[PDB]
Structure formats: C-alpha cells, structure tokens
Design a protein around this nucleic acid. Structure first.
Ligand SMILES: C[C@@H]1Cc2cc(F)cc(C(N)=O)c2O1
Ligand SMILES: [Zn+2]
Ligand SMILES: [Zn+2]
Lengths: 456, 222
DNA sequence: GCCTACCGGTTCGCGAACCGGTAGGC
DNA sequence: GCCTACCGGTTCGCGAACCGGTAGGC
C-alpha cells in the first residue's frame, strides 16, 4: 500500500519495507455484544498510528518522528505486538483476546450505443453507490485492495454461519462467526451495533455483497492497466480490455423482431411491478467462447435463455464469461446448488438487474446454453454431483412458455410463447429455471439494454 | 451497558463537567457515559454528586438505571434514591429481606475497610492468588473480591471456558474467553465455589472473623 | 485508543562526622 | 616522651531525584 494522507506527508517520504515484509499493517477489532467496531492502521514512513471507529469521524491519529531508523523498527514491532498480540514475522497468525487482527491488504471510432455500453459498465462511482446499501466501508476500500485469500476466508465464515443456522447451533458459535466476518470485512454501521448473522437470508445478503464487491475490484483491474500510448482513444482502450466483439443489431433487422417478441411475450403475470422497454439489442461475441463451446454444438436440446445480473457485474461477465460461484461460498440462495442459472422468461431474469425508479436502465443477457439431457426437479434440492448421462438440471414451474409456439434461431430453440399451465403441478416453483454446472456449456449470444417503467 | 454510573472517586484527579473542579478522592460522584471523539469507546463524564442534578438529568429509578448502585454503601444508596426524586406475609418477607439486604451490604463494607486498615495491596493480591483467583486491576476492585471471597467463598473456575466469575450488581458474570474472538456470556446467581482458605499468615484474622460472620449465600435485589 | 499523575523501589548526591596519620610545642 | 590543633580521606545517613509499570481520565 501507499502512504496514508492523514499523516500529511504522503507526497514527501515513501513508506518503508525491509526487503520483503512491508512495514505497514491495517488492523481491526469488533465485538458485537459491546458494539465496538474499530480500526487501527500502523505505518513506518517517522512512525504513523491511526485509530478510531470504522466509517465515522470518531477516532484520532499520531504522526511522530523517530530519533533514528533502527529505533523505528523497535517502536514499530513493539506497538504492533502490543496491539495485535503476535510478532511481526509468523508462520500462521493467531487471534488473541481483546487484541486486534491484521487485515490482508494487497476521436473514438465506435457506435454511439456501444460507447454508452462502456459508459454504463465502467462507471465505477455508480458501482461504489451500489455498495453503500450493503454497508461496506466506502472510505478506503477503492484504494485498499482486500486480498484474495482474505475474501475466501470471508466466504468460508459465511458458509460456516449457514451450517450453524441450519442445525440450530449455539449463540456463541454464531456470535463468533458474526464477529469474525465483520473483523475480516470492515463494515460501516455508524454509531450502532453490528447485527448478528442469524438468519438464512442474512448470509445470502452478505454472500451477494462479496460477489458484487469482487466484480468491482475486477472492474478496477481491467480499467487500471494496458499500454498508455498516444494513439487509441479512451473508450477504445476500455473496449479492447473487455475482450469481446460487440455489434449493434438494427431495429429494422428481422432477428431483432424475435428478441422484442421474446421480451414482450415472456413477461410474468405475477411480476407486474414494472414494465419493460427494449432500448437496444447488442450481438455479443466473447474471445474464444466459440472455441470452448464447439464440444456442445454436438449436444442436443440447445435453448436460447435469459440471464439477468447487476450492471456492476457486466464489466466482469464480458471479460471472463459467466462463472460459477466459488467452492468457499455458501450454497444459500441457490435452488439447486452452485452453477449458471437461466430463465425462459425475461421478467424473472430482469429482477436480477436490480433497477429502481431512480436508476431505470438495466442489462440482461441471452445465451445459447446447451442443456442437453435434462435432470428435471420439482422441489428445491442442493445437488453436488449430477445423475449419470445428465448434462443439466431443470426446475419445473407452474407457468411455461407455449411449447407448440417454440420458434427456432440459428439452430437454437427460442421458447417465446406466452404462459400456459405445465404438465405437473406438484412443484414449489412458479416459473422455470435452467441450470448448467460447467462454464463451457454457456455461449452468450445477445446483450440487451432495458428501461423499466414502474408505477409510483 | 448503562447510560449512567455512580461510585466513590477512585482518584482525586478527574474534574467535574459542570463546574470544572477536581472531584476529590473517595467522594460520591455520578457520571453520564458518552461516545469519545478520540477513540471507539464509551467514556464517563464525571460530575460532582451535587452538580449532577442541575444539568437537567432525571433518573426515575436509580437502582435499575444507574450502574454501581448496589456496590455503594447502604446509607449512600438512600441519598441517591431520595435525591433522584428531588399482604401480611407479603409485606413481612418484603420488609425482613430489606433488613437482611442492609445486613449483607454493610457486613462486606465493614470487612472491606477492615482489610484496608490492616493489609496492603500486595497482601490482598497474594490472598487471591493463594485461593486460585484472578487478581483484578484496581485497588477498590481487589478488596471487593477478597471481601466477596471471604464472606461467600473462593469462586471455582467456569464450567465451559474455565475463566473467572465476578460479582457484578445483580449476578456473577463470567469474564473468561470461550474463544479468542468472543467473550464468554455465562451468568448466574448461584455459582460453584469451595470454601475460602486464608493462609496461616494472619494475626488479625481472628479479629476480622470475630465480627459475627456465619455461613450465608449472596442475597440479590428484588 | 493514548496521555500522565501516582506508587514503591532503588539509586544518587552531598554534607556531617568519624578517624588515623602527623608535625609543631612543651 | 606526651598533647593537640590541623588536614585528607573514608564512611554514614537521609532526603532529592530517578524510573518503569500502571490504574485512572479523557
Ligand atoms: C442465480 C439466480 C437464480 C435464477 C433463476 C433464474 F430463472 C434466472 C436467474 C437470472 N440470473 O436471470 C437466476 O439468478
Ligand atoms: Zn462540580
Ligand atoms: Zn465462562
């Protein structure tokens, strides 16, 4: 990391490191019962100590010049151990009672709608606002990159909570994981106590947070880099970083009428809170997504299905394709385990865009997902391994798009019929879900841009 | 936990928030707990007991609102209770309990300042260590646990976390660590404890124990 | 969280005093 | 042969000063 500007000597003297270990650590401590939720940043520029309650004006600091450079190591490693409990070097860290825990820090030639697409998916201040509702620390998280091993442990703590919640474990067991999580990931609750992770959807909410938070740091990783040479334009630099060939499907096109039909037709009767309005249609072609999908063009039963996600995620979804949840993450929220989920209805998928009356525009996908021999399920069931010969899973719903009006498209079955009753009604799903447990089975075809019309 | 706090001045150093003069040592003083601007933690705003009631604060029921009320001396509790404002068997057991509650309050206080007269802090520290007790930080708190130890008994370790239980207002709270991340939350009015064993070194133990002290359990507020 | 007045425990500084060696007087 | 006024040097006694660990304050 760089120098903390609270010292006032940020662009004057560099932060020091002895060969490998950088003399700079950001500690944290939270006790849900007491309500304390604090930070403690230590640095060696001069020694600098910062402390207070995370996400508020509560706190103070002490910049202090040393007599010498060897006295700095003495003052630094002493202050460190006094606060954290451990020595500066260690094989594995161990938390100590009421001591702190250290956090692991690390002229454009394109169409106007395509420029707006980059404008929409690379505005990171919009992604910052998106995290404000989650209560993630807004102050130093953009400059302070939280480690990958750290976030995996944060995922692991969430998965431990769901396990603890499922079999009604002790309050202390839950208290620990709630403490552990908020220590590991600094939250901003202001002057009130961190809430206990006791619910089934509270872990899901914090699981979704980590998924979104990750994609913002990924969006930064794309934006920060490349070759800054005076030749290409700023928007073109970010376009090439997406690693995809995006084209604008004209409204006069015959295939464009099919999508607008697929949008208009497959709106849910129950999801009457909003009304869609297709602003644009983009034909999308990822880098080498056809090379990996070649195997599954042999596979039968290929369907063109909807998949919605936050506008923040589309920065990463274009660059890496659709990805399955990590193995450390919790299975909560998912109906049939971790995998890429799809819907035959635009509305059901459109809810995952997370739009409001203030933020109207939203992005939804259409991918040629090779379902193949399907494993049909009625009730929710967390699966680990698929049955033999099955390449996908299907959640059977009450309403299904008319199978006698299934139009084809480039050798892909598009179920754009209106809703009718299904074959079986002993299910706990209202609409269909299509699940693939392999990132190769999906092949993204179209990216849409949708305006939502509410009534308030 | 509580908003307010009352105790005898642990030092004649702290100033009074209203009048800004030094609150003298061992004097009745009251506080209001506020959020410290300098660090993540509550801090007491100490007032002179006289000055506390002119700022405009009106504690309806001190015993349930103010912290450290039960630890005060019996006659001093009544001063707070009055100044805050400005059937046969039922009333008998009610009245006779308050008789036994005073009996227990000023029994410990007689025992407390008896040890303060005769014993130094190091003697009281080594008293607790001999009885396998955690030595607390603070002068007042040391003889508070020694007096608790002698009258009722040497507190046995906790059931799960193996820590030290401590009397706090209305119950014995566990102060140990169930884990490194979290504190233990065991609480009880009837804790486990063996008998208090004073070492041979006590030429005034016959004088202190001669103050009509028989076997009895901790009595609590209603 | 960090600052600092307070506590006990030891050292330090300096003048009184103790003391032995001595040279001028008778 | 004593006595004794004078001087250099060691000890002794006691209050000032020093100091590290810490309970209380904000
Ligand atoms: C992962 C969730 C579950 C789910 C079901 C579904 F039918 C569609 C979606 C989606 N992202 O459009 C979806 O996202
Ligand atoms: Zn006052
Ligand atoms: Zn315990």
């Amino acid at each position: 990391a760089a120098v903390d500007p609270d010292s006032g000597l940020e662009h004057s003297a560099h932060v020091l490191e002895k060969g490998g270990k950088v003399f700079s650590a950001t500690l944290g401590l939270v006790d849900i019962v007491k309500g304390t939720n604090s930070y403690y940043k230590l640095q060696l520029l001069w020694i600098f100590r910062s402390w207070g309650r995370v996400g508020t004006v509560i706190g103070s600091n002490k910049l202090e010049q040393m007599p010498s450079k060897e006295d700095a190591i003495e003052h630094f490693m002493k202050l460190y151990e006094e606060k954290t409990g451990n020595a500066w070097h260690s094989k594995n860290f161990t938390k100590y009672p009421k001591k702190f825990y250290p956090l692991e820090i690390d002229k454009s030639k394109l169409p106007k709608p395509v420029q707006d697409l980059i404008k929409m998916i690379f505005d990171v201040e919009s992604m910052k606002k998106a995290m404000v509702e989650y209560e993630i620390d807004l102050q130093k998280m953009p400059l302070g990159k939280l480690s990958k091993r750290q976030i995996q442990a944060a995922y692991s703590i969430l998965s431990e909570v769901q396990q603890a919640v499922s079999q009604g474990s002790s309050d202390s067991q839950i208290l620990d994981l709630s403490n552990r999580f908020y220590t590991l990931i600094p939250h901003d609750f202001g002057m009130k106590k961190p809430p206990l992770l006791n619910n089934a959807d509270s872990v899901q909410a914090k699981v979704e947070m980590l998924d979104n938070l990750l994609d913002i740091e990924v969006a930064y990783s794309l934006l920060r880099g490349g070759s800054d040479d005076s030749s290409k334009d700023p928007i073109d630099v970010n376009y090439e970083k997406l690693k995809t060939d995006i084209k604008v499907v004209d409204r006069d096109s015959e295939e464009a009428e099919i999508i607008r039909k697929y949008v208009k037709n497959t709106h849910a009767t129950t999801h009457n809170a909003y009304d869609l309005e297709v602003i644009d249609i983009f034909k999308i072609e990822r880098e080498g997504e056809c090379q990996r999908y070649k195997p599954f063009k042999q596979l039968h039963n290929r369907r063109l299905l909807w998949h919605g996600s936050r506008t923040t995620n589309f920065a990463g979804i274009l660059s890496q394709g659709l990805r399955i949840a990590p193995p450390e993450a919790p299975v909560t929220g998912y109906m049939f385990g971790k995998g890429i989920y799809f819907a035959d209805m635009v509305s059901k998928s459109a809810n995952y865009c997370h739009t409001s009356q203030g933020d109207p525009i939203g992005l939804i996908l259409l991918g040629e997902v090779a379902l193949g021999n399907m494993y049909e399920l009625k009730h929710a069931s967390h699966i680990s391994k698929l049955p033999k010969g099955k390449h996908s899973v299907k959640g059977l719903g009450k309403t299904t798009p008319d199978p006698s009006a299934n139009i084809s498209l480039d050798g892909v079955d598009v179920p754009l019929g209106t809703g009718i009753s299904s074959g079986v009604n002993d299910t706990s799903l209202l609409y269909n879900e299509y699940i693939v447990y392999d990132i190769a089975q999906v092949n993204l075809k179209y990216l849409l841009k949708l305006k939502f019309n509410f009534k308030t | 936990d509580k908003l307010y706090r009352v105790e005898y001045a642990k030092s004649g150093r702290a100033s009074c928030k209203k009048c800004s003069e030094s609150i003298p040592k061992d004097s009745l003083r009251m506080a209001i707990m506020v959020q410290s601007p300098m660090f993540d933690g509550k801090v007491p705003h100490w007032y002179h007991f006289s000055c506390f009631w002119k700022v405009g604060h009106s504690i309806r029921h001190p015993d349930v609102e103010v912290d450290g009320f039960s630890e005060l001396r019996w006659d001093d509790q009544q001063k707070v209770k009055k100044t805050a404002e400005a059937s046969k068997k039922e009333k008998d057991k009610d009245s006779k309990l308050e008789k036994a509650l005073k009996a227990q309050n000023d029994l410990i206080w007689n025992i407390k300042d008896e040890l303060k007269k005769v014993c130094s802090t190091n003697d009281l520290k080594e008293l607790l260590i001999f009885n396998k007790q955690q030595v607390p930080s603070g002068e007042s708190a040391i003889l508070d646990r020694v007096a608790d130890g002698m009258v009722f008994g040497a507190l046995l370790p906790c059931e799960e976390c193996s820590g030290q239980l401590v009397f706090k207002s209305d119950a014995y709270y566990c102060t140990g660590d169930v884990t490194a991340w979290t504190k233990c939350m065991v609480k009880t009015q009837t804790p486990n404890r063996k008998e208090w064993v004073t070492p041979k070194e006590f030429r005034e133990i016959s004088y202190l124990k001669k103050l009509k002290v028989k076997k009895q359990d901790r009595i609590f507020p209603p």
